[PDB]
Amino acid sequence: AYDFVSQELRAAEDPEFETFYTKNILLNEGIRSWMAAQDQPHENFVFPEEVLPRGNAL
Amino acid sequence: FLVRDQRLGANVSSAQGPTGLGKYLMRSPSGEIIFGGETMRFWDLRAPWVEPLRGPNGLDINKIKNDIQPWQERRAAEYMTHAPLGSLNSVGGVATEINSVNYV
Amino acid sequence: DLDEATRTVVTDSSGNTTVLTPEQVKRGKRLFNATCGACHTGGITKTNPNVGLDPEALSLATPRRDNISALVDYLKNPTTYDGLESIAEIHPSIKSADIYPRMRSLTDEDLYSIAGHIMLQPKIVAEKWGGGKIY
Amino acid sequence: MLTLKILVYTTVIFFVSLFIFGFLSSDPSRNPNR
Amino acid sequence: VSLWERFCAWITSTENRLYIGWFGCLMFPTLLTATSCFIIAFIAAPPVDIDGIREPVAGSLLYGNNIISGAVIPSSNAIGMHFYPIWEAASVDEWLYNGGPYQLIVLHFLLGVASYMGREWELSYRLGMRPWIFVAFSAPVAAASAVFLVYPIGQGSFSDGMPLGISGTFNFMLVFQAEHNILMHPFHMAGVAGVFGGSLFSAMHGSLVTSSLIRETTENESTNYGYKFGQEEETYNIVAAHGYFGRLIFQYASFNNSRALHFFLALWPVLGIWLTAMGISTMAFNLNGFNFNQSVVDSQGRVINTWADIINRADLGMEVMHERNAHNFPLDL
Amino acid sequence: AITKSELNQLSYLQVKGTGLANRCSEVIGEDTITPKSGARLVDMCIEPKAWAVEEEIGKAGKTEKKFVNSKVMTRQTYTLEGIEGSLKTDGGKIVFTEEEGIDYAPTTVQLPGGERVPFLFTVKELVATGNGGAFKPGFQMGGDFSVPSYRTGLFLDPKGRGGVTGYDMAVALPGLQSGEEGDAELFKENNKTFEVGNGRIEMEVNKVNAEESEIGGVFVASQSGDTDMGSKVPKKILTKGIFYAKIQ
Amino acid sequence: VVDYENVALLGGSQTVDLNNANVRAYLRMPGMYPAAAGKIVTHGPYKSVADVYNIPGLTNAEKEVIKKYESRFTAKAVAPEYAIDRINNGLY
Amino acid sequence: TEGTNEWFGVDDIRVLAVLFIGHYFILSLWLGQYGNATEDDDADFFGEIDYTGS
Amino acid sequence: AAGESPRFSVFGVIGDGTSYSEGAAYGSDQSAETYSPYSVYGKVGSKDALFEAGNAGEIARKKGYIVESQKRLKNLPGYVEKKQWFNVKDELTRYMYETRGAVRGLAQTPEQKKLAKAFFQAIEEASLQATLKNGDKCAAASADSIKLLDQFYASL
Amino acid sequence: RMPAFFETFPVILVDKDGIIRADIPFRRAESKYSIEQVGVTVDFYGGKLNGQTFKDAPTVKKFARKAQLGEVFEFDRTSLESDGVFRSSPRGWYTFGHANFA
Amino acid sequence: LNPMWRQGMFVMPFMTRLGITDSWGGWSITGESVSNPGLWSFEGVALSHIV
Amino acid sequence: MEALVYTFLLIGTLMVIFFAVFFRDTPR
Numbered sequence A: 001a002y003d004f005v006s007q008e009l010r011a012a013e014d015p016e017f018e019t020f021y022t023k024n025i026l027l028n029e030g031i032r033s034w035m036a037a038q039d040q041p042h043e044n045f046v047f048p049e050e051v052l053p054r055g056n057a058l
Numbered sequence B: 001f002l003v004r005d006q007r008l009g010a011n012v013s014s015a016q017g018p019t020g021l022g023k024y025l026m027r028s029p030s031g032e033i034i035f036g037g038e039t040m041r042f043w044d045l046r047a048p049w050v051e052p053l054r055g056p057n058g059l060d061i062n063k064i065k066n067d068i069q070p071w072q073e074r075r076a077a078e079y080m081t082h083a084p085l086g087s088l089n090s091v092g093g094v095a096t097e098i099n100s101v102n103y104v
Numbered sequence C: 001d002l003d004e005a006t007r008t009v010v011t012d013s014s015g016n017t018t019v020l021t022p023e024q025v026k027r028g029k030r031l032f033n034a035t036c037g038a039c040h041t042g043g044i045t046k047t048n049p050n051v052g053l054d055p056e057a058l059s060l061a062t063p064r065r066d067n068i069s070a071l072v073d074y075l076k077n078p079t080t081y082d083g084l085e086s087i088a089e090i091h092p093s094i095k096s097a098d099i100y101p102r103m104r105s106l107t108d109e110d111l112y113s114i115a116g117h118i119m120l121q122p123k124i125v126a127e128k129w130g131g132g133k134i135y
Numbered sequence D: 001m002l003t004l005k006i007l008v009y010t011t012v013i014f015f016v017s018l019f020i021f022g023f024l025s026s027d028p029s030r031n032p033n034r
Numbered sequence E: 001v002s003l004w005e006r007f008c009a010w011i012t013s014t015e016n017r018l019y020i021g022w023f024g025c026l027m028f029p030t031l032l033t034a035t036s037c038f039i040i041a042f043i044a045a046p047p048v049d050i051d052g053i054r055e056p057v058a059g060s061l062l063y064g065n066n067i068i069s070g071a072v073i074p075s076s077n078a079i080g081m082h083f084y085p086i087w088e089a090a091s092v093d094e095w096l097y098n099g100g101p102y103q104l105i106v107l108h109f110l111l112g113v114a115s116y117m118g119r120e121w122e123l124s125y126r127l128g129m130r131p132w133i134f135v136a137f138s139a140p141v142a143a144a145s146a147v148f149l150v151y152p153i154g155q156g157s158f159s160d161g162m163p164l165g166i167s168g169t170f171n172f173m174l175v176f177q178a179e180h181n182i183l184m185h186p187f188h189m190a191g192v193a194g195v196f197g198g199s200l201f202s203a204m205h206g207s208l209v210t211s212s213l214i215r216e217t218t219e220n221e222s223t224n225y226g227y228k229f230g231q232e233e234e235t236y237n238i239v240a241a242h243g244y245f246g247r248l249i250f251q252y253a254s255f256n257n258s259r260a261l262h263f264f265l266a267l268w269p270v271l272g273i274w275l276t277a278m279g280i281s282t283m284a285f286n287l288n289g290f291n292f293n294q295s296v297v298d299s300q301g302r303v304i305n306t307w308a309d310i311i312n313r314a315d316l317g318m319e320v321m322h323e324r325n326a327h328n329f330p331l332d333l
Numbered sequence F: 001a002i003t004k005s006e007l008n009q010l011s012y013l014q015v016k017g018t019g020l021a022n023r024c025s026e027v028i029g030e031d032t033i034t035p036k037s038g039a040r041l042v043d044m045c046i047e048p049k050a051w052a053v054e055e056e057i058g059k060a061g062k063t064e065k066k067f068v069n070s071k072v073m074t075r076q077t078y079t080l081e082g083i084e085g086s087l088k089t090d091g092g093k094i095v096f097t098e099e100e101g102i103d104y105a106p107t108t109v110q111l112p113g114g115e116r117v118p119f120l121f122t123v124k125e126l127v128a129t130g131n132g133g134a135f136k137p138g139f140q141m142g143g144d145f146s147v148p149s150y151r152t153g154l155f156l157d158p159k160g161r162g163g164v165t166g167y168d169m170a171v172a173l174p175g176l177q178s179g180e181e182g183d184a185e186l187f188k189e190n191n192k193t194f195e196v197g198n199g200r201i202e203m204e205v206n207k208v209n210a211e212e213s214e215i216g217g218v219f220v221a222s223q224s225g226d227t228d229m230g231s232k233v234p235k236k237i238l239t240k241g242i243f244y245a246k247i248q
Numbered sequence G: 001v002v003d004y005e006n007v008a009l010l011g012g013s014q015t016v017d018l019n020n021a022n023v024r025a026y027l028r029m030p031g032m033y034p035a036a037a038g039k040i041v042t043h044g045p046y047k048s049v050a051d052v053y054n055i056p057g058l059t060n061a062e063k064e065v066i067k068k069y070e071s072r073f074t075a076k077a078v079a080p081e082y083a084i085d086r087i088n089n090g091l092y
Numbered sequence H: 001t002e003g004t005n006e007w008f009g010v011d012d013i014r015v016l017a018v019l020f021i022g023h024y025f026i027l028s029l030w031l032g033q034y035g036n037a038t039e040d041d042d043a044d045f046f047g048e049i050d051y052t053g054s
Numbered sequence I: 001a002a003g004e005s006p007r008f009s010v011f012g013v014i015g016d017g018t019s020y021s022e023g024a025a026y027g028s029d030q031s032a033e034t035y036s037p038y039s040v041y042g043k044v045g046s047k048d049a050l051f052e053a054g055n056a057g058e059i060a061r062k063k064g065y066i067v068e069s070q071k072r073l074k075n076l077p078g079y080v081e082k083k084q085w086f087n088v089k090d091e092l093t094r095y096m097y098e099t100r101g102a103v104r105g106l107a108q109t110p111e112q113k114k115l116a117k118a119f120f121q122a123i124e125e126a127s128l129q130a131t132l133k134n135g136d137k138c139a140a141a142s143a144d145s146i147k148l149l150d151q152f153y154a155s156l
Numbered sequence J: 001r002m003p004a005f006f007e008t009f010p011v012i013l014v015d016k017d018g019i020i021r022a023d024i025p026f027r028r029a030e031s032k033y034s035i036e037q038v039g040v041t042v043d044f045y046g047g048k049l050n051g052q053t054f055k056d057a058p059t060v061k062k063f064a065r066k067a068q069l070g071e072v073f074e075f076d077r078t079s080l081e082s083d084g085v086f087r088s089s090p091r092g093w094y095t096f097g098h099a100n101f102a
Numbered sequence K: 001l002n003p004m005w006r007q008g009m010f011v012m013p014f015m016t017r018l019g020i021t022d023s024w025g026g027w028s029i030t031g032e033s034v035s036n037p038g039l040w041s042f043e044g045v046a047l048s049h050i051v
Numbered sequence L: 001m002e003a004l005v006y007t008f009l010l011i012g013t014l015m016v017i018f019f020a021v022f023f024r025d026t027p028r
């Protein structure tokens, strides 16, 4: 039970719709991207710095 | 970081941040000129190393442009890296830092 | 183990090397973590991230600071990245030890050990000295 | 907006005074062992 | 008899359907206004700029939210810890744009729950009881106060308080774990042990008491019908339950005194919740949990990882992605 | 208080929270200045006092383009300060050529109905030409300026898409990545653009103090609003207010 | 924008665009970072590489240090989303 | 305003007036019951709770 | 490899002692003297310390501070004339923050101590009268401070 | 290729040994392995697009995005008004139901 | 060209027949700008009948 | 249009609670 399809569609077509649900989705994306490389060493994941998702400044 | 960017040649009064609000300087909800960023919540601060640059309506642009002394720079550099953050076993720094410093 | 092949670092600009004693390593780590670690932890610079302590940044500096002698000279007389202006009043050094009281009890051996620690770290950790939070 | 402030202040002081003067009216003696 | 005496007699009367008392004079109006404002705001409030960067977030049902995703957004980051009543705004629209209702709701609600504790004690006194139920109730009040008021005070802004919504709490927890490394603070461990042990003891007590019921109904009647309001029967036929617990485990461990058993039942979860609330309050001032990043190295000096390093990687992933447009400088002080 | 000399007599702790910091000062006198060569206008302050947005309204069985009033949703953070420029004379007229200072401030206003209209109040890159050769009551000047984008290239929309950073597709809908044409119907929202606007300002002088070399008056301005990184059609804004400047 | 043609001139290659690159792109040319790069990244658009020598206030030293690396420079069209962040672009 | 330092938030005469009116009204109601108390040395008691009528 | 006993060090007294990780060493693992067993550095005034005390650089720095402080002090009468008290309070703390350090470092004889104390009292009075918004007392204190600092620099 | 255990995966191109040669950057400021910089081309064999080649960066990037989900097909997205999120086959619903029942 | 009788409103005409013309949203039924609608607006009446 | 459903469900729950509290079987 991962997504609410209607909110995802509206956010895709309207770049001003925002709730806490989308914030949690972004946090999940960050967790996956920054954890997978070392959490599953047998997959030989290689992610260059230019590909890792990140916000401004830090 | 204001001092560093200004020394590099920037005009730190007209710089626009990612949100369009002001990267270094902005206004408080009552009008006073304050520092920009997430530190807009701490605009009530008054410290002996920052008062010499304040006027009757906030920070003074003319004093900031060409009257900042090296000792204020030293104080700011020292205070930035000794913020009151740490862990129970006295590591110091943000919660994702490595074991190099011993400070709480 | 920490062999002698991994304790060999370059000393001067010509290219001559030396072997660091096991006690020098301990002294260098202790003194570095005590004096530098507030601002130079992990090989980065907190108050100016554009100028790091990784070997590549040290090599592309003007007076070239990728060896023990240049690091000691910098500790005795700091300059900017192009080596044009002196920054002794906004950086700890022997010349400005009257401003920074934490540099008043340092001998030549202390500077040698600190420079040795800085030079030795890349050969041990590799791509994690000055790499940042990604690693 | 001043009239709203006046009304709210009146309500708050009314209830707080009720509390204060209620606890001063020999409350410890209001127990089933009187 | 004076009018004031008659009023005092009515207020502290035990004949009312719901006790009023003198703590009720504070409990009722505050809770009622908080409830009204919360319902209206949760249904029909406009978007609120929480981060102070002019990026409002929608939280009401009428603006495209469901029950799970709806919330009441905390106040703006530009306000900080400043008091923001209705009469201090240029218009009601500005008050709603800057997250006004959050402060009103939380303040009137905290006053209400404190008065609720007082009212519990007051009725206990009037009925001739022993005055220690509200001490037990003080733990949830401590936790709620801890979050809602103490965390903003330490962090310096009301915008860091827990949102009044379902997914807002998830956001709060994730950011808190990223920034303070909870799950390594021993007080959180104490709280988790408290809740787990409370559930375990509740299940054990229920099973033991229900199994030891004496036969008074036969088949075609629910067993609950055998008890009469006012019946005298101690809450466990001993031989059965005592022998069962003495045989199930090591025999010397068996509570044969009801007073001690019920005291332990009351003591365990309350102490756990007290400790976890104090842990949250202390981490509000940046005294985080244990840090074991890069603590095992080989002879040469290379780093050997542990599970703490994997937790650190997850924390870094959470940290670099929260409040994406709000930061301008390398450190999140 | 009202004049600069009275404002300089107060302390910072005496002004905090009152709202005086967002006000603009007042000038007393009716003289003439006449700028020499190498003069610079320093310490300019511009304070709006009314806002309006162009719309379509119904008067009586008809519709017309009328400017409707709006209420400021933000707070006292809309005054420009510290603007500096370099004065010169071409053919007997004065030219301003604004250079630096705090010359921009975001603002949000609400229209009757509930719509919120953000815009970037600015005078960046302003060249104003006067009708005379001296600063006297009745002097007027005005010119065009350039309006930058409301959001820069580092901004990320709620789905993580930006101009110079972020995703370039809608990662939440992997079913739109099939066929010869993929997510071509979301190209407008996936392709962020940053284009400049324009504006116009007119100023008139009312008071001049020669012994202090100060001027003051009123202004009328108009410009375009936010475009949301090129996904919506910008509106038009009209403002009025006062101003203050020093010729030292 | 989704597609940007001159992405290799922002600091990831051996050629640096004079109109859009950040100040960090000059850190790999020795003797140029804190003095000449700051002057270069804070002045108006250049129609050619030869236009950088007309900056009002260039001392000699900056002139020859720029002449040394002139072969690594180019001047393309100004993109407002890149030229506004040439002192600080949020990368640390 | 907001950040100023007025006593109890009082910035107008009407606020002070209504505060006084509230305290005084409830005070008069309470006085209507407890206004005949005396300090003579026979209304005192020796105990933990004042059961001496009024 | 096949079998090797691990290295042991009991409290630094029974074992190797210097194994890159010992703890509770308090020295005794290096061929040098320390300030104390709880310290990492050596004695400040030791024979091999690179930093002297009172060399030419310190004296030059202090004298430059004093000269520029005199130049800065020569601005207060204008501020008092224009009734700009915030300028008066800011000037005494912006550059002159190091004046106390320089004066206390360059004063040895008792008369120099008396002059320094008088100058400090004068500037404190000037700041107090500036924050109390009294023009005459502030002007008198500023003149007194200028005279006292000139006398102190002359006595050097 | 995207593992079945993820929901969003970065686009990476590797050679026969696993060394990266190109990708689609998240931050376009100091990138070194962008498709524009490396200059990758795509050719098609078999199927509807047999024999065609593409050389401009945008089309190559579009096909690279499409190619991380496996083979590429043409769909009819209007008859049922498809939304764009994957669903499960009868092999999964049966397992869910009967396992929970047991 | 889009009056209220073309949108299916049934109880609103009886509200505006007797005097109600302003809404808390800042608009009026004749087309105007409202600064302070007051208590008796299109929403106060509904809340009053509810209470 | 689902906001109507959400509001109806919440108000129904509140009505159930009201009836449970005030119209209750006597404990005697």
Ligand code: CLA
Binding pocket: E113, E139, E140, E141, E143, E144, E146, E147, E172, E173, E174, E176, E177, E182, E183, E191, E192, E195, E273, E276, E277, E280
């Ligand atoms: C299996 C794993 C697990 C478990 C068991 C817990 C367990 C707990 N966590 Mg936790 N946590 C976990 C994983 C886990 N965590 C992880 C992985 C994270 C990182 C993401 C966190 C992050 C986290 C945070 C950030 C916090 C917790 C907290 C807590 C505690 C909850 C406090 C509580 O509910 O009582 C407290 C009780 C209340 C708050 C209720 C108050 C009731 C009020 C007074 C009255 C309400 C009345 C109501 C409004 C009206 C009633 C309706 C009417 C009709 C009847 C609890 C001990 C919290 C804590 O410690 O609390 C201080 C806390 O802040 N955790």
Ligand code: CLA
Binding pocket: K011, K012, K014, K015, K018, K045, K049
């Ligand atoms: C203080 C009381 C009060 C007030 C001021 C209002 C005000 C309002 N109501 Mg409300 N209402 C109330 C109480 C009140 N209500 C109560 C208690 C109920 C429940 C029964 C209702 C039920 C109600 C409904 C169902 C509706 C309103 C509506 C309205 C609005 C339009 C009223 C209208 O056109 O009526 C017109 C009234 C009449 C035409 C009545 C005519 C009276 C007949 C002709 C009497 C004839 C017999 C008489 C005895 C003859 C003998 C006398 C003779 C000898 C002199 C208005 C805002 C309407 C609206 O727009 O809501 C949104 C609407 O649809 N109200």
Ligand code: OEX
Binding pocket: B038, E155, E159, E160, E175, E179, E323, E326, E332, E333
């Ligand atoms: O608000 Mn809630 O989270 Ca405490 O850090 Mn800074 O601010 Mn925001 O970021 Mn990280």
Ligand SMILES: [Cl-]
Binding pocket: B036, B037, B038, B039, E326, E327, E328, E329
């Ligand atoms: Cl920041």
Ligand SMILES: [Fe+2]
Binding pocket: E235
């Ligand atoms: Fe029982």
